[PDB]
Every structure is written in C-alpha cells, then in structure tokens.
C-alpha cells in the first residue's frame, strides 16, 4: 500500500495518526516494522502494551467516541526509524484484513557520520577463473548516501560497475558495496585502480595496484 | 519461552504450489491462533490467513481462492500451501502467533461485540522468489588482507537470495560485517562479508569463512591468508 | 568612499550607528544596497519607513538633540546581507550630495553548504571552430569561497584557466565559474580532464573525457 | 503602481556625451521630483543630480561642469546627458523619484527649516562602459547533457556586459541558473547558462536557449540535444 | 609511570583525584607538565598557589582527615590538556620522591579545524647532490590525526615515506610533516607527484610537478 | 626575578659519566634549594636529587648509587654528574628551586611534623641521548616559494635532537612555523622550517635562515629565493 512520511526530530515525541478513523468502538493495534525484519507488536489493544516495549510507546484509549487512534512516541531515537502500522478494527466495519498504511518515521537531527572505506584487489583465485573483480566496502557512513566513482589509473571507469543502495546498519548508520568487474588483463595492463566515494561535501579515495 | 522458525523453499516456479512450514519452540499448536504474513517489495505488509486453535480456518479474500493452511499437532508445525503463484508472490512470509481479543461495546446478550486478532510473536522470515530461471550455486573467493586490518570473503554469483555466512564456522563474531548483495545484469547476486582483527592476528590465528546457499543445497569454506 | 564593515550573528538585532553625527536638527535617511541591484529606501524621515519594509527595522527619532542615527536591524538573516547608507540631513550643514559611507553587514552562523560542481566538455559546435572550452560551473557553497584546480589526466594545468570570484545567488549561497581554454588538440590527445573545487575543508571532483 | 526602466549605449568612447534616458510607468512625470544615480565599481553610490515637478535643475558640484538633466513631458521620459566622460564614469545608472520633505526645527516664518529629498522608487539600473574598445557580439554553444540531468548553453567572447539569457523564449524557468561572467586577459566577457530538467524530459521537450547582446544588437538562439 | 586518562567537555569543571590517599595530615602539590616542555607548579600546599596561575586552579585542605586530595580545575580550555601529577606527601609515609602517577586530560568538544597543507618540490642544491626529497606540511588541524598519501602522477608510491606524528602547536592546533624520498630520476621521469591529507571525513591534496 | 638555564652535552656514550649545568639569574645560588629532573619518554617525571643552601645532598634511592650532585658559589651554577648511563638514561633533564615547607601536624617539641619540597620556578630543559652513534651535523636546503606566499628551509640527516632554527638571525618572528622533526630508517632526524610573509616581500626582502644544532657546533645559514 501507500506510504505516508513523517519526520520528528532527534528526543522529540512523534506523534503517528491513523491511517483510518474509527465509526464506532474501537479496538486499534499499533505494529513497528523495519522492511527486511519482522514487524514488532507495540500496542494491541488501544492501549496494552506487552513485554519488552518502553513505556515512552503510547496509543490512546477508546475512553469516549470521536478520540482519534495515535500512537505515541516519546523521546524519540534513531532506533525509531522504522513503518508503523495501525491495524483498526471497530464495531462498525467488517474484518480487518488490511494493515492500512505505513508511516515511515524518520529522525531528523542525528550526527554525521563519514564512511570508512575498504578497497580489495582481485583474488588470485578468481584471476586463475579468468575473471577479476574490484570490491569497493563503504560502511559506517550517515546520512546513507553516498556516490561512488571508479577509476582505471586517473582516467575514469564507468563501464562494469555495481553499486548497492545504502542499508541501514545494526549500529544506525549505513553500509553500501560496489563492485568493478572486468577482465584480468584490464587489471594486469592498468597502473592502479581507484575507488572514490563521496559523501556528504566531502569525497574519500581509496586505491589499490597489482603489485 | 515461545519461540517460531519458518523454512520455504526459497524459489519456486511460476504456476506452481508454494509450500512452507513454521515450527513452534518452548509451546504447544493447538491452543492458540497462528497467522500467514508476507511482506512484498514495494507492497505493505499483507495477512495472508490465520487458523483457530481448534483447527478452523479463514482465508483473506484477497487470496482466499488459492491459498490452504493446515496444521500438525504431533509436534508443533503448521504448514502453507500457495498454487498458481505468480511473479507478484514472492516476499518474505512471517509466521506469528495471533491472540484473540474480545472488544464489547454494548450487551453481549444482543452480540454487541466483535473479535479482533493481534500478532505477538513472530518469526524470522523466510526469502521466497518466484521465478523462471533455476538456482546456482555461489562461487567464494577469499580476500587477504595486508592498527588493525580486514580481510573478506567475496561469494558471487548465486541465486537467489539469500546467503548466510559466518566466520570460524561461528566462532568469530567480533566486527563481522556482511554486506548486502548486488543484483548483476546478468541475474545473479553477490555478496562479500569482511571481518577486522587484530593486525598481529595474522600469524596465525586460522580464519575460515563458512558460506551456505540452502536453494542450492551448495555449502561451501574458504580460508584467507596473505 | 570607505567601507566599515559590521558582524552580526545570525538572529541577533544589529546597530548600525551613522557616519557622520548630526550638528542641529536632522532628517536622516537610509539606503539598503547590495551590489549589482538597485538600492533600497529603508527609512526616509528620522524613523519613517515606507510600504513593504518589515518593523524589525527602526531608526531613532530626533526628539532631544544629541541622540545619534542608528539603524536597528532585529532579528537578522542571511538576506540582511548588504551595504547600508546614511543620508545624514541637518539644519546646521549644507545640501547633503553624498550618501556617506557604507555599513558592510555580513550574517555569521549561517549554514555551511557544499557546492553542487557540474564540468561540461567542449562542444562539437566549439571544436568544429578549432577552438575548445571547458566549464566548471560551482554553486549552492557557503561561505562563499572555493578553490579550483584543473588537471590533464592526473598531471596539474594552471595555464588557460579562469576563474569567477564567487558571487551570491537569490537563495543567499554563492556560485563560481571556471573556464579551462585549450586547443582541440591537446582534449583529443590527452585522456581525461578533471576540476578540482575545494571548499572549508574538503575536495570534490567532477572528470569529463571525450567519448 | 509607478515603475522606472533605464536606457543607455552601454558603451560610450572616451571624450563623448553619455546619454541615457528613464521612463516612467503608471504615474506622471512633471510631478515628482527625480534623481539620477550611479554606482562604480569600489566606490560608493554617488548622486548626480535631480529635476523638479516644475522641471528646474540642480546638479551635483561633483560633476556640475559637465552633466546636463532634461526631461520630457508628452510622455513620462527624462533623459541625462554627461559628456567629457572618462574610464572613471562607467558604473550602473539608476533611475529614482525624489520625494521633497521639508523638516520644520524653529519657526516657518524665519526660514528655520531646510528641504531634504529621499528616492523611494528606484529603476532596475543601466550597464554603461566607458571604452576605446568595439563592440562585438558573443558566440553562443551549446551543452549538451547526459535522478535529473542538466544541460547549458556557453556564451563566450562578448563585450561589454551584459548579455540576459532566457530559456525557451521565457516559458523554461525552473531550475535556470545563469552564472556571472568572466573576463579573460583578451578583454572579452563569457558567460554560461544551465537549467536542471527531468532526465525523462531529453526526448522529446525541445530546449531553446536565447541570448541576446543589445551593445551588438546580435540576438541569437541555440537548442540543445545529446 | 602508567597514565590514567580523563575527558571533560569544553567549559566544564574538571575533578583530577590524587593517584594515592594520604594516610595522615598531608602537604599534596599539583603539577602540570605537557610533554616536551617544562612542569608548572599549580599548587604547592595543600591549597596555596602561586602567582601566575588562574583562580580556576583550586586544590582540596587538609582541614579534617578523610578528605581525599583532588585538583579541580573550572571553566576548562584547550590549554588545559597535559599531565597532571599529584606529589603526595604525609606524616606517615615516607619521603616522597616519586611524583606518582600522570592524569592525562583531554578537552572534549573543541572546534574542528581543517589542516593547511603545503608541498615542496625537490630543492636544486639537493637535486645537485643527487638525492630529492618531498615535503609535505600539515598545519592548523583538530582533531590531531591525519593521514597522509603519496602518488607518483596518479599511481600510488609508500616506498620512501616518513611521517609525523601530530604534535600540539601554541595555538592549540596539530602539525605534522611527511617526507617521500626518491632518487633525482624518479623525479624527472614522472610528470607530477601529489601529497593527499585526508583529515576527518575530508581529504585534500596539494600536488607539485618539475617545472 | 629569577630564571634558571640548563646546559648539556646531548650526546653521551654508553657507560660514561653523563655532566650536566644550570645558571641562576637574578638570584643567589647557596640560599635556595634545587632540584633535577629528568622526564624519559613513555616513563613520567622522575627525581633525580637535590641540594640544600647549606651545600647539603639527598639523592632519591632510584639512581643513589650513581649520582652526585654538586654547586658552584662563585657564580650561580649547580652541577649534575651520573655515570655509568645506559640507554634509559636519555631524557629531557630539567632544572628547578626547591621550596623547603614544613608541614606541622601535631607538637613541634615532639617532632610531630616533616618536611616537604616543592619545586615553583623550573628551567626549560635539556635534550641528552645516550648512544652509540656519533654526532653529525645537519644539511639545510632552502625550499623557494612561488594572498600571500610561504618558503622554507629543510634541515635533514643530523644527529641528536634538537635543532634551534630562526629566520633572519631573529629578526623575522611573524608566520615562522619549524615543524618537529622525522626519525628515518638510517637513524638520523629531519627538520623543516616555514615562513608565510606576503607576497610582494618577494623583491627583494632577504629571507636568511639560521640553523644551530650544538651537538655537533655546526652552525649554518642559507637564503631563499624563486
């Protein structure tokens, strides 16, 4: 379905709306869902919380009608990065198959971080294949995007390049690879082999060589 | 205490049965709820269908023609069945366990009250691709290194996703780092995990990269050393 | 005439005192101007303003005499940026022809930004002419400063650049040109050209070759 | 309401009469007061002179002995005229309404006030070099482009400034970025102008670059493409 | 002797704790000593200090026992960083010859300060001893670490190179130097040689050629 | 009122009594007490001694059984003798006042106090390397320049440290910037010294760089220019 953003600063308290209003008594289920995990109940009913969720994770009661279903976030952190779903069941309309929408959260204010790049030369092995490969590790880099340029010598190399779109790391900051392909005589016949990954204002070179 | 783990077949064919199974660790299948979710890319999440504790079911009509959960109590599996999948059916399919609530709004002599379901423990996901072309095995590569320094272990070329990978066959764990993978013009994946150690390390503290790759049944090690 | 310049954090109110103190009784008017635009009347009377002026500028009276001429500025912003002018009137001295000095504001803690470098080869229509041109052309950078460096392949040329002394934009960041000119020859013969634009503390460049 | 756009040579020789004139748009001419300013390179914004609604004169002692202020009323046009002119006098000329204020400090009746006069309107100001130098007429190219692209349009060899560049005749107008000029040792201006544009938007939205250099009269047009 | 280190944030009020506690009445000095550079006597009894040095410095009495010895040190700057020695004298113990241990502090959250690189070529009176050296200067950085990178044209060179560790400037600032030794013909022979200083997230070269 | 200055060979032979001086000025020698001090790398401040006015020595246990401490009345210089010096030995050996203070804790007529020294007014320190190999004296090359400019003076291959560099014989003072020195693989240190002055100084304001390195009394000077 559709995705509806929302940005709140860094220690902040994001405040997440649902997707659909209720038209009678309420029973609102509040899921945290980072893509490529499994989501995480935060509230099933309008208010319980279970086990091992913080208190600063609040939805709001059906105390009277016309209370609109938002879940609450205080003291927000980078963690929070994630989509929340907002699972509406009330007395009104039928079953709720459908999740609803997705807010995607996202918290503003958080350090720059420059990348640490990692630049491998082909393996002997996959030299002995016939085939040689440059791999270019950026990680530890925020925020997550950075462009990457390949160089054969000092003139560039465009042709046989692939770059990964950033992922978002463990530790909240981002990883992203890029892999130069080209055949073992284009790495034998050239000096060196550059990758330069630019981030943010600043740009960071690594190179390497056959020596 | 409850624990759930999934298992799929990673790929399957276009106008075929999926089949996938979810085990159940630390509780029993035939007291609670469990649900079907799969989360395309692009798409939100998607329920798929749930079964009751006494064993009943009940599709999502958005899929209702198509899709048969089952159950088996001799242990704790409760299994999937998709047909006709198409290019559109493959995701990551969670398994979790649902709870019934009961909201009452008004008599529940007149039946003023509606059942709500809620998942609390899920699984892990199981990568399912639906897809003409046939797996492959990856093909590793070690990558030597030369404060501290970082050696890696390329796997490239396999299909599909995903890969596991662990250093020292799980021993080593401190600064691992597995990159995601690269989808090539020619179809294929490839991965490269990289690991930082001690310098002095190198002599000679073995480092042995374990690579699976469970859609080609294709396990496979490498060591690197400069 | 001289320029006395001023320093004003940004948000803050500045004083902008006159520069010739009044001898009687005085109508003092004054001039907001950045160069390369057409003035800006602030204050006319001795604290009357036009239309389309906001409050937050404010000149002083003359009730008691002695009190001297001084612009307010409160809350200022990068657009505040510009030479201000004092038309000092009075009773006692004669016809006022000049404007006076000039009152150089510039807005500190504004945000640093980094340039968006763009590099154009020479075109076809330019070489057909035997004659070949390349552009570095640098924008959105604050503050306003960069430096340029052309390269033949990996080996440095200085000789047939030039380079424009920033200038600032609508959106109060700047922008600077670079012209590499050389013989069709020495593009052909050569593998790749790069520009080099370091800005605060880092470098980004932008390789063009021809292809 | 009340609007002024100046007009000049851009260029005038060494020992010859500058002249520009200055329209009025919405208002009337001969009642307001209007000044002629201009703005050199390192110096400040000097005042040259003013004409009242009754159309009398006072020239700046500055350059008294050699400007002359006119006006003429059949339509809202006042022109100057400054001759003898040497490198020192090219600057941007403005065009502005002074508006008389008469500050009362003693008594009316001895003559205890004096008149001040503030420009409250200005015009948009008129580019004038004084030069032994010709005139010549730029030479347009184009550049060509390859989430978004951009493409651009170098106008190099011209004097004197300015030249204005319009994209698409005037309808292109976001994302247009016209960049200050450059004056190389020949003694020759070059510009460069850049608009951003969709990438998808290369096939097929015809880009027109227009470039026009009144000291030349040489107005001429270029499109882009890859 | 082993050095326990302590970080404290810009402008906060720094608490250095004696290395080891008096067993009786006490007469504890403080001296502060910055490696390279003579010790500065903070505080010689138990409280007294002498001319010359800030209010800022301030040290325990001993008015009853139990009363640990702790140098406090308000409002800290840049200038603050170096050892700290705690000399401990008391009635019981002996005499006291060793100075103890060294309380490294370390000021968090000083300005970041880009380095100021400058590269010179290969003297003629050492061109004409057939040997060539390559200087490259690094100034004016914080935080003192930098990294250094020697290309001949673009390839790479590391055979040959000496660098600094960075060291403490007057003006609170790092500095470090890097020589890259070659013959006089792998200086004539190649076209440029270029000196990359990356610093931080950014990274700057200054390169020189045989012209 | 008082400044103490140090004095030493800098380069000391393996087993061989290492001599060191130190001046007084401004005050008296025989009514103070003074210290030495030696500050190894790595290793914190060490104690080496000290002398009463009565001419009364007190060695620390640490280095008791070979060094003597001596004074000279006659002037204000106290010396230092340490044999038998090995490679640990090398260090800066400063020089400094010890205040006697006495501390009182109980009753004086039972002894119920002690004294403590206090080091308030130091030198500045002398560099002393103990070591096999000889002594040699540097060779400075200038590095001619090309807002403003920068030259400098390269003093490479000597041996021990330091080095004292001035521009001008002291008079150039502003922008100078000597650089702490390299440790190469032969063995031998490397400085460099560097001036920013403006530009236009160029013609023709005489850089004159001074170089001492007293461990070898080869003094030199060399002048820059493009």
């Known amino acids: 379905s559709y995705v509806r953003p929302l940005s709140v600063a860094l220690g902040e308290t994001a405040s997440i709306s649902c997707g659909r209003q209720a038209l009678g008594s309420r029973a609102v289920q509040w899921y945290q869902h980072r893509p490529g995990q499994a989501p995480i109940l935060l509230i099933y009913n309008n208010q319980d919380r279970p086990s091992g969720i913080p208190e600063r994770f609040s939805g709001t009661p059906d105390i009277n009608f016309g209370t609109r279903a938002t879940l609450t976030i205080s003291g927000v952190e980078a963690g929070d990065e994630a989509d929340y779903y907002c699972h509406m069941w009330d007395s009104r309309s039928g079953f709720s198959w459908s999740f609803g929408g997705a807010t995607r959260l996202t918290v503003l204010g958080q350090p720059k971080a420059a990348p640490s790049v990692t630049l491998f030369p082909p393996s002997s092995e996959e030299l002995q294949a016939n085939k040689a490969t440059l791999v270019c590790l950026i990680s530890d880099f925020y925020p997550g995007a950075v462009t990457v340029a390949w160089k054969a010598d000092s003139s560039p190399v465009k042709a046989g390049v692939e770059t990964t779109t950033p992922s978002k790391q463990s530790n909240n900051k981002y990883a992203a690879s890029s892999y130069l392909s080209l055949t073992p005589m284009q790495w034998k016949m050239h000096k060196s082999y550059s990758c330069q990954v630019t981030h943010e204002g600043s740009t960071v070179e690594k190179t390497v060589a056959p020596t | 205490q409850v624990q759930l783990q999934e298992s799929g077949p990673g790929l399957v064919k276009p106008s075929e049965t999926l089949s996938l199974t979810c085990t159940v660790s630390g509780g029993s299948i035939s007291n609670y709820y469990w649900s079907w979710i799969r989360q395309s890319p692009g798409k939100g999440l998607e329920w798929i269908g749930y079964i009751s504790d006494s064993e009943s079911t009940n599709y999502n009509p958005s899929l209702k023609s198509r899709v048969i959960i089952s159950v088996d109590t001799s242990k704790n599996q409760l299994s999937l069945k998709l047909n006709s999948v198409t290019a559109a059916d493959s995701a990551i399919?969670?398994?979790?366990?649902?709870?019934?609530?009961?909201?009452?709004?008004?008599?529940?002599?007149?039946?003023?009250?509606?059942?709500?379901?809620?998942?609390?423990?899920?699984?892990?996901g199981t990568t399912v691709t639906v897809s003409s072309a046939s797996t492959k095995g990856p093909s590793v590569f070690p990558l030597a290194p030369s404060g501290t320094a970082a050696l890696g272990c390329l796997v490239k070329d396999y299909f599909p996703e995903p890969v596991t990978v662990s250093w020292n066959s799980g021993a080593l764990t401190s600064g691992v780092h597995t990159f995601p993978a690269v989808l090539q013009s020619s179809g294929l994946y490839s991965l490269s995990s990289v690991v930082t150690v001690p310098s002095s390390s190198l002599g000679t503290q073995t480092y042995i990269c374990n690579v699976n790759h469970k859609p080609s049944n294709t396990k496979v090690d490498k060591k690197v050393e400069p | 005439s001289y320029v006395r310049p001023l320093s004003v954090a940004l948000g803050e109110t500045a004083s902008i005192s006159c520069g010739r103190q009044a001898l009687g009784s005085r109508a003092v008017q004054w001039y907001q101007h950045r160069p390369g635009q057409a003035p800006i009347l602030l204050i006319y009377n001795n604290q009357d303003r036009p239309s389309g002026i906001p409050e937050r500028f404010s000149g002083t009276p003359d009730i008691n005499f002695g009190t001297r001429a001084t612009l307010t500025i409160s809350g200022v912003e990068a657009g505040d940026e510009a030479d201000y002018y004092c038309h000092m009137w009075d009773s006692r001295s004669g016809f006022s022809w000049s404007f006076g000095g000039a009152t150089r504001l510039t807005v500190l803690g504004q945000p640093k930004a980094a340039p968006s470098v763009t590099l154009f080869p020479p075109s076809s229509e330019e070489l057909q002419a035997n004659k070949a041109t390349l552009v570095c052309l640098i924008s959105d950078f604050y503050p306003g400063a960069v430096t340029v460096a052309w390269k033949a392949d990996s080996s440095p040329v200085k000789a047939g650049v030039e380079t424009t002394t920033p200038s600032k934009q609508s959106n109060n960041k700047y922008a600077a040109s670079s012209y590499l000119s050389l013989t069709p020859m020495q593009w052909k013969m050569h593998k790749s050209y790069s520009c080099q634009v370091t800005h605060e503390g880092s470098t980004v460049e932008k390789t063009v070759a021809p292809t | 309401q009340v609007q002024l756009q100046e007009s000049g040579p851009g260029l005038v020789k060494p020992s010859e009469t500058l002249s520009l004139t200055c329209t009025v748009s919405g208002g009337s001419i001969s009642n307001y007061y209007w000044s002629w300013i201009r703005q050199s390179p390192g110096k400040g914004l000097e005042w040259i002179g003013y004409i009242s609604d009754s159309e009398s004169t006072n020239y700046n002692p500055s350059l008294k002995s050699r400007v002359i202020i006119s006006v003429d009323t059949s339509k809202n046009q006042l022109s100057l005229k400054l001759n003898s002119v040497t490198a020192a006098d090219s600057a941007i000329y403005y065009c502005?309404?002074?508006?008389?204020?008469?500050?009362?400090?003693?008594?009316?009746?001895?003559?205890?006030?004096?008149?001040?006069?503030?420009?409250?309107?200005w015009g948009k100001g008129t580019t004038v070099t004084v030069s032994s130098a010709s005139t010549k007429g730029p030479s347009v190219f184009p550049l060509a482009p390859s989430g978004t692209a951009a493409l651009g349009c170098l106008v190099k060899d011209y004097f004197p400034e300015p030249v204005t560049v319009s994209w698409n005749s005037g309808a292109l107008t976001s994302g247009v970025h016209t960049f200050p000029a450059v004056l190389q040792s020949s003694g020759l201006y070059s510009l460069s102008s850049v608009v951003t544009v969709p990438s998808s938007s290369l096939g097929t939205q015809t880009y027109i670059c227009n470039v026009n250099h009144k000291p030349s009269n040489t107005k001429v047009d270029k499109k882009v493409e890859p | 002797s082993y050095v326990r280190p302590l970080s404290v944030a810009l402008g906060e009020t720094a608490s250095i704790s004696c290395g080891r506690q008096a067993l009786g009445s006490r007469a504890v000095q403080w001296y502060q000593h910055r490696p390279g550079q003579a010790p500065i006597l903070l505080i010689y009894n138990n409280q007294d200090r002498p001319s010359g040095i800030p209010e800022r410095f301030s040290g325990t009495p001993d008015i009853n026992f139990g009363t640990r010895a702790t140098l406090t040190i308000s409002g800290v700057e840049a200038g603050d960083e170096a050892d700290y020695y705690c000399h401990m004298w008391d009635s019981r113990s002996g005499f006291s010859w060793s100075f103890g241990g060294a309380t490294r502090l370390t000021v968090l959250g000083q300005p970041k300060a880009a380095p100021s690189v400058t590269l010179f070529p290969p003297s003629s009176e050492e061109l004409q001893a057939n040997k060539a050296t390559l200087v490259c200067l690094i100034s004016d950085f914080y935080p003192g670490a930098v990294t250094v990178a020697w290309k001949a044209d673009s390839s790479p060179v590391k055979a040959g190179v000496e660098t600094t560790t960075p060291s403490k400037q007057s003006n609170n600032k790092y500095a470090a130097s890097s020589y890259l030794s070659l013959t006089p013909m792998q200086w004539k022979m190649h076209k440029s040689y270029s000196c990359q200083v990356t610093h931080e997230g950014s990274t700057v070269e200054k390169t020189v050629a045989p012209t | 009122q008082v400044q103490l200055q140090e004095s030493g060979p800098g380069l000391v032979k393996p087993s061989e009594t290492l001599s060191l001086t130190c001046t007084v000025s401004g005050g008296s020698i025989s009514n103070y007490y003074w210290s030495w001090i030696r500050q190894s790398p790595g290793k914190g401040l060490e104690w080496i001694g000290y002398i009463s006015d009565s001419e009364s020595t007190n060695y620390n246990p640490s280095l008791k059984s070979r060094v003597i401490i001596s004074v000279d009345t006659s002037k204000n210089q106290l010396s230092l003798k340490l044999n038998s010096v090995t490679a640990a030995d090398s260090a800066i050996?400063?020089?400094?006042?010890?205040?006697?203070?006495?501390?009182?804790?109980?009753?004086?007529?039972?002894?119920?106090?002690?004294?403590?020294?206090?080091?308030?007014?130091?030198?500045?320190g002398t560099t002393v390397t103990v070591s096999s190999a000889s002594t040699k004296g540097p060779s400075v090359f200038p590095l001619a320049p090309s807002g403003t400019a920068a030259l400098g003076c390269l003093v490479k291959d000597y041996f021990p440290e330091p080095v004292t560099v001035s521009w001008n014989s002291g008079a150039l003072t502003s922008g100078v910037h000597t650089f702490p020195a390299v440790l190469q693989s032969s063995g031998l240190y490397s400085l460099s010294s560097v001036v920013t002055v403006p530009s236009s100084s160029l013609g023709t304001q005489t850089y004159i760089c001074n170089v001492n390195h007293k461990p070898s009394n080869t003094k030199v000077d060399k002048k820059v220019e493009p």
């Open positions: 502005a309404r002074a508006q008389q204020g008469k500050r009362i400090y003693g008594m009316v009746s001895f003559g205890e006030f004096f008149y001040y006069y503030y420009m409250d309107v």
